Amino acid sequence: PELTDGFHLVIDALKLNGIETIYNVPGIPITDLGRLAQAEGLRVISFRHEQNAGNAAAIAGFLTKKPGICLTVSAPGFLNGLTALANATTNCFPMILISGSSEREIVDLQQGDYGEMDQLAIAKPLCKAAFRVLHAADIGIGVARAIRAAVSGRPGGVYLDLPAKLFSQVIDADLGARSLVKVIDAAPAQLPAPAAIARALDVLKSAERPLIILGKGAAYAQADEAVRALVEESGIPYVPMSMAKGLLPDTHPLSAGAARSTALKDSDVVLLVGARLNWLLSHGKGKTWGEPGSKRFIQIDIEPREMDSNVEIVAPVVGDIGSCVEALLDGIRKDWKGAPSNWLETLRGKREANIAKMAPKLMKNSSPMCFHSALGALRTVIKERPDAILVNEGCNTLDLARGIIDMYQPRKRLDVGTWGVMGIGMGFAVAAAVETGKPVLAVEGDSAFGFSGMEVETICRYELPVCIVIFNNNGIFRGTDTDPTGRDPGTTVFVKNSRYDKMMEAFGGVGVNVTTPDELKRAVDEAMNSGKPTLINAEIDPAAGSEG
Amino acid sequence: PELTDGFHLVIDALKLNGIETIYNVPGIPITDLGRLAQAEGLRVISFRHEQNAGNAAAIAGFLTKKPGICLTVSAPGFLNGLTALANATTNCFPMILISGSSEREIVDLQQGDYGEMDQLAIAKPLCKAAFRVLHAADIGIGVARAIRAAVSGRPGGVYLDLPAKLFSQVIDADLGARSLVKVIDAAPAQLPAPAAIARALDVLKSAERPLIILGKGAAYAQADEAVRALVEESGIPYVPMSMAKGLLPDTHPLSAGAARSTALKDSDVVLLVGARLNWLLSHGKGKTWGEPGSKRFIQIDIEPREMDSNVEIVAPVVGDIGSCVEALLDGIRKDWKGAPSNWLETLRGKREANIAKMAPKLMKNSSPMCFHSALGALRTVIKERPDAILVNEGCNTLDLARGIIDMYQPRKRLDVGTWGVMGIGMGFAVAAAVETGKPVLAVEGDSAFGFSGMEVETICRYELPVCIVIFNNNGIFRGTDTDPTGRDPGTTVFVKNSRYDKMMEAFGGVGVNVTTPDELKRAVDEAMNSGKPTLINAEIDPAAGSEG
Amino acid sequence: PELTDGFHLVIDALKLNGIETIYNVPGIPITDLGRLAQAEGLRVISFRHEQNAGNAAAIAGFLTKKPGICLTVSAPGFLNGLTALANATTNCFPMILISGSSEREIVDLQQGDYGEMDQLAIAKPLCKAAFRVLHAADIGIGVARAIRAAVSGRPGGVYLDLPAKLFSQVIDADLGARSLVKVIDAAPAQLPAPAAIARALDVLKSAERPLIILGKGAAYAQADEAVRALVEESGIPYVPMSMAKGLLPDTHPLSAGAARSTALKDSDVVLLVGARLNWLLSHGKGKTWGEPGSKRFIQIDIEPREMDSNVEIVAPVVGDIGSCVEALLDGIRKDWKGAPSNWLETLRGKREANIAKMAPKLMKNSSPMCFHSALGALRTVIKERPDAILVNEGCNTLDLARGIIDMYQPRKRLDVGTWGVMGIGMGFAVAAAVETGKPVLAVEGDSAFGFSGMEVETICRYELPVCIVIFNNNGIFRGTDTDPTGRDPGTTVFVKNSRYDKMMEAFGGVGVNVTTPDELKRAVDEAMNSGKPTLINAEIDPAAGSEG
Ligand SMILES: Nc1ncnc2c1ncn2[C@@H]1O[C@H](COP(=O)(O)OP(=O)(O)O)[C@@H](O)[C@H]1O
Ligand SMILES: Nc1ncnc2c1ncn2[C@@H]1O[C@H](COP(=O)(O)OP(=O)(O)O)[C@@H](O)[C@H]1O
Ligand SMILES: Nc1ncnc2c1ncn2[C@@H]1O[C@H](COP(=O)(O)OP(=O)(O)O)[C@@H](O)[C@H]1O
Ligand SMILES: Cc1ncc(C[n+]2csc(CCOP(=O)(O)OP(=O)(O)O)c2C)c(N)n1
Ligand SMILES: Cc1ncc(C[n+]2csc(CCOP(=O)(O)OP(=O)(O)O)c2C)c(N)n1
Ligand SMILES: Cc1ncc(C[n+]2csc(CCOP(=O)(O)OP(=O)(O)O)c2C)c(N)n1
Ligand SMILES: [Mg+2]
Ligand SMILES: [Mg+2]
Ligand SMILES: [Mg+2]
């Protein structure tokens, strides 16, 4: 009768579970797998490097709460994708790295097969889960296992190994169709115990200076209405982490973002909503949090092992952010005195003061452009385009764009994440445009852009509405370092006055060079209104910024 | 008295053992280490991605027989360099991956440190050896162990973990000097037992159709005149593997490289000199080697475990290739009746027949230009510049240049190696220029170039004598595949008529576009005579080549 | 002021979190730690082999829902305990392996330290979590991380590495006390989504022949009242897995355990309660589960990744068993038409018929005594002592005892578990006596007893009320195999008539040798009435049973 093969079973299983996009790099043994995927209706985005394909799948999971799919080749390409898979596991982004595998009997004897590697054994230390499928009748379960492990609990990167012999296996079509699995409740809701919610309300009500910390886990949870209702109805000031910006508008009257240091030092009870007390929050120790013993933490997290990871947590609340926030909110709507207005006014005054010190730098046109004057232009662009996605990476380009550029809608800012990775830029830009269809503004340091620069060709090839702004200051941090022996360039500088706009022109994209904030503002508007792939080489003062 | 620190002990340990070059990417916590190396006289080449820095270190080890040094950054950058470190282990290239790491007490408890990763534990499954240095007094011993493990036995990649607190430690300067170790016999000679040489000669004399196969291990050994004497004085025909080309000149009268399939099929005794019976030699099984049981193998390898890896080896000879071929040459000099005449003259038959079949394809003009006609010009360049270095990667551009371009001096060709990696090009080109001082011809496929093309800025920054030729056929293998749904481009194509030469001009380099073999020869000759960094975009027929 | 050290901080951290018993084997560097633990009130149990101390800590966690503590020694003893730690992770038992480790700077360079091993990196691929504490101020958080990982989520074995340098560090006593963490909600409740509960009930209400399967996860949860109510109020027949026997009395009228084949083969909807569809349930595949597509599974489990692991689960319920069973039970009390009576009467007939065939063998008293008749005596013992603990391991001794001996109270049967490990017997028996204070009856095969028999001295030394019954059939499976060459004993046999009773008396315990079921009965009653350590050597027909 009718027959099917491993090629079609893999594709049929992915389509059955809502997968629409495959980021990949072709080659042996997965070339015809990607072709069949494209012929079956899936959109296939081919990159110049598997790591950039993996970065796209990673941020795609963050944007969609569905696992981003990265398909790669044996050993060398698998390793390029595994580095992105490890970064996805670090940031709690759901993702499935699918990779071709060589002949199992040669690899297990280490006889030197083509692209030889026990990729299953190599992947496990660096990701959340790893599975290998040897039989075509198990492709449905294998994909189902990979999806569950990627989106359930704490989301993360999963590795799905498919040996080349699997694709050519042939079984009965009706048998294979019944073997496919459409996953029921891939990321199930987990509700907290009422005894834990009651303990959290008790601590929260006792606070003289409470504070909510919104992490990117709260943004990933996509409980926007519930999270915002928790902030407003409680009246407690909040501070968003980098990728939680825009969940509430960064100009919200309860936002203490421009007063982050005071809100963290002077608070007494802190509510962590999908935010880890890691290096980004000084591990809960030091002067950042005031004197030892002055803090009490309530924590909302799907992973119960994250509790007591750094300091004592008196009110652990385990469950998905959607279910736990609504449980806290339902306890607040039935009983809540109010946040002390003294704490509100202290943060509001210090916030306005910091914004006042910031305002002159934004309107300080000078030659050459400083970081502040250029970001003042891009901040207005985002304010005028609150639906656009902002990719951002670098050091000065990153740390200053985070504090200057206000976000207004959730999940619109995508940056270096937990490992502080340089190289996420162009891969994130491709996935942001592919997944959402919104315009992407990619604010890049010139050192950060170089880690993934060749993907501007991929951006051009698929005609994506990405506007790349390179803060060209001729180096890492600054461009003033020099060789004391007078023989080489500096360890941290690049070719002086590099014209990255000419690099974009090499692939049919728009290339612009600007030297003033107004020239930058006009060039960005032209690019984001037209939707054409654009790279804007912006000249930044090589002396401005910091070495850190 | 005077004090020193871990920053200086690390440099003084590397200086003491002959390290002259550091390939790296600056950042936390190793930026000051790279600046001090510049101040202490080492050459620091800073790349745009860490993988290309490590690819440079791997090929620099192959060229120098001294370990190549890649200095990287914590976890995100360590993983980027670890990929190339694993490739060096696969190709037996001596290399040391030096990476900073975070606080040991925060990573041990997995509390989310800056760039958190137990890089020692993660490196061990992927490289030859891994070490971590906690105390400054052990920096010298740590560097010693890293060097010995890198160059001794079968060479390979070594990871050296330096925690950030190690640099800041301060000890007595005189005590620190007496802690440094100048390694004695880092790669010692290993001489084979006479009874194993005798077993080999008995098998060799019994041969009626003997064959020598020179692998890149023999080219790495730098026993050139001995290896050549073994070939010429025994009269036995030889077949050179890819990167063993040029060890003997490829037009040598004893070369059966143009009769490779006949030499491998009909021979009865094969002498492997630093060559593994892996996928590159069909694992010693199948029709490539004629009928089963018709082969007896003599294998010369430093690794005793390489024997009997795939098929039975009747005459194993374990030791460094220098000591082994010389001991084998003495036995031949004392007792050898020559090589059977009709076997050498049968190979000359198929050799001259295959070359004559190739000739009309090297002179056939076409529009667009094909692979064979363009490589016929590049073959003349290498013949006219016989001491220039050839870097070559791709698929059609790789396999066709390997058979068309003849090398004349040893260690002059650097290609994808054992894993078939794409992305080594610009890294190998940088190291070849820096380590040797020779000119570099980089023959690249457009897909292969994309994996590492961003480093053309590094090629320009240090003004290295690199001439890049992109075989632009608009995609992988071919440039004709299309999306059957007509929505996106095909999975294996790129932006049609991409002008990579414009990208080179973005960083100050020379950019040329050529369309004929005659134009290609002029541009290469001008670039390699001037020594200026140059990228030549060669338009290749999108329909030429092989689809696989 | 007042000072404290790492020794006291480790002990006080365990005492603060409710730890009361430490299973260990003393040595360098943890000898003085165990001494301090005993001096500080904790009960320290010293074994003859670390693997048996770990097996004690493993089943101790299953019995108490608090992690069992094994203290071991560097590398060689760590590896012994790690083997038990891996098995605890396989069986989802909460357990912490605390090992001392060598000098970190010497191990990191692999210089050959006393007990040199990176025990953190070795334990990670074999257990659920692993941490290493370097500073005394992190001992409190370190213990809190080990406890949370051990009991929360799917419980499992955790490794806690304590370098020897840690124990001797001295800090302020008030600073040290404030650094301790008393874990809040170490194993939090996880409530299921109402929509998931609605889906399960609807699938349940549509069942013509529903079946409940209770796994040892339901026994571990200690929701005995809720689980018994779910079965008795729904009227659905249930099948208990091995260590779930007794949760409901094995003679409960709703039990179909004596009709297991018909229940598993002919049912249509199967509610798994803490049971995995693994080898012990034929992976939900094959004739065991009837015809393909005749089954629909509801699964209650705390691990969301366990769903769809073998076959498709149409109704996954994710949460702790206490919350999910109560959630199911709440809806059943609102609307439930009652279980189909034809399904009950069909199974009740099969249960009556099956027990009839087992009946004659249970009282067939031949000479030598056979497996069925001897276990028939021990089946009477457990009925008369429903509060006593049963430990059971072997092959024939395991399978037949599992089916013949009925359990009447929850968590009284402790057997080989998920991996089928031989050697859990004596370690489990020590933990069961110490943790529960109840009489322990250990039914052992002579081959299984050899994996841990040396621990009978541990039983005697601590005067534990353990009654050991060795089923001495003189070999593995059977004692009839011989050497076909007539030189050695058979590969599977032992010394004929080995007097394990006279071995017990070598350490002060009571030893008996019985040959009839009544002799076994009178000896077991006498042993368990007195509470003295006793071993009965029961002479079993060497030809009885099966093999393989
Ligand atoms: N759906 C979810 N429900 C609850 N917690 C979540 C969910 N998704 C992610 N998290 C938690 O969010 C936390 C994010 O921590 P981090 O990634 O450090 O946020 P940021 O880095 O913005 O502070 C992780 O601990 C993760 O477990
Ligand atoms: N100095 C040396 N002396 C002897 N054998 C060596 C030396 N350096 C490398 N080798 C051997 O060379 C062999 C190269 O195998 P391969 O890398 O497969 O060469 P190719 O790929 O050109 O055949 C390896 O087995 C390695 O052990
Ligand atoms: N507290 C709990 N709440 C829910 N499920 C649990 C709990 N403790 C253990 N489990 C589940 O119990 C299951 C045990 O499966 P198994 O160990 O195979 O039981 P048996 O061996 O009787 O089948 C595991 O999947 C584990 O996740
Ligand atoms: C993969 C990786 N490699 C290296 C680093 C170290 N690093 C941190 S920031 C940075 C570059 C910062 O320079 P740039 O992108 O030009 O932004 P600027 O500060 O100059 O505005 C680097 C290389 C890193 N974080 N990740
Ligand atoms: C890291 C890695 N990714 C993917 C592959 C699969 N692969 C094999 S050859 C090749 C590129 C061939 O295209 P090109 O470089 O343009 O040479 P051409 O055949 O077009 O002349 C690729 C991507 C690989 N070998 N390595
Ligand atoms: C650690 C370990 N080693 C080996 C085995 C293999 N094995 C399974 S059952 C068994 C012994 C069965 O013989 P016995 O314990 O005497 O019980 P009997 O069947 O004779 O009643 C063994 C060795 C195992 N399950 N575990
Ligand atoms: Mg910069
Ligand atoms: Mg190409
Ligand atoms: Mg036995």
Numbering used by the authors:
A (entry chain A), B (entry chain B), C (entry chain F): 21 to 568
What's the publication's text?
Here, we employed structure-guided iterative saturation mutagenesis to convert oxalyl-CoA decarboxylase (OXC) from Methylobacterium extorquens into a glycolyl-CoA synthase (GCS) that allows for the direct condensation of the two C1 units formyl-CoA and formaldehyde. Previously, we showed that besides the decarboxylation of oxalyl-CoA into formyl-CoA, OXC from Methylorubrum extorquens (MeOXC) is also capable of catalyzing the acyloin condensation of formyl-CoA with various aldehydes, including formaldehyde. During catalysis, OXC and HACL both form the same α-carbanion/enamine intermediate. In HACL, this intermediate is generated through proton abstraction from formyl-CoA or by cleaving off the aldehyde moiety from a 2-hydroxyacyl-CoA thioester, whereas in OXC, this intermediate is formed by decarboxylation of oxalyl-CoA.
Thus, after screening ∼3600 clones in six rounds, we obtained the final variant MeOXC4 carrying four substitutions E135G, A415C, Y497F, and S568G. To rationalize the effect of the different substitutions on catalysis, we solved the crystal structure of MeOXC4 to a resolution of 2.4 Å, modeled its flexible C-terminus beyond E567 and compared it to MeOXC WT and OfOXC. Structural analysis showed that C415 is in close proximity to S568 of the flexible C-terminal loop reaching the active site, suggesting that this substitution is important to (re-)organize the active site for the new substrate. Substitution S568G lies within the flexible C-terminal loop, adjacent to A415C, and likely provides space to accommodate the bulkier side chain of C415. The third substitution E135G caused the greatest structural change by creating an extra cavity at the active site. Thus, the E135G substitution does not serve in substrate accommodation but likely allows optimal positioning of Y134 during catalysis, which is supported by the fact that kcat increased approximately fourfold by the E135G substitution, while the apparent KM value for formyl-CoA slightly increased. Three-ordered water molecules (W1–3) are observed in a structure with a trapped α-carbanion/enamine intermediate, with W2 (in close contact to W1 and W3) proposed to protonate the Cα of the intermediate.28 W1 is hydrogen-bonded to residues corresponding to Y134 and E135, while Y497 and S568 form hydrogen bonds to W3.28 In MeOXC4, this hydrogen bonding network to W1 and W3 is lost due to the E135G, Y497F, and S568G substitutions. This change in the water network likely helps to promote GCS activity at the expense of the OXC reaction. In summary, our structural analysis showed that the active site of MeOXC4 is reorganized for improved substrate accommodation and increased catalytic activity.
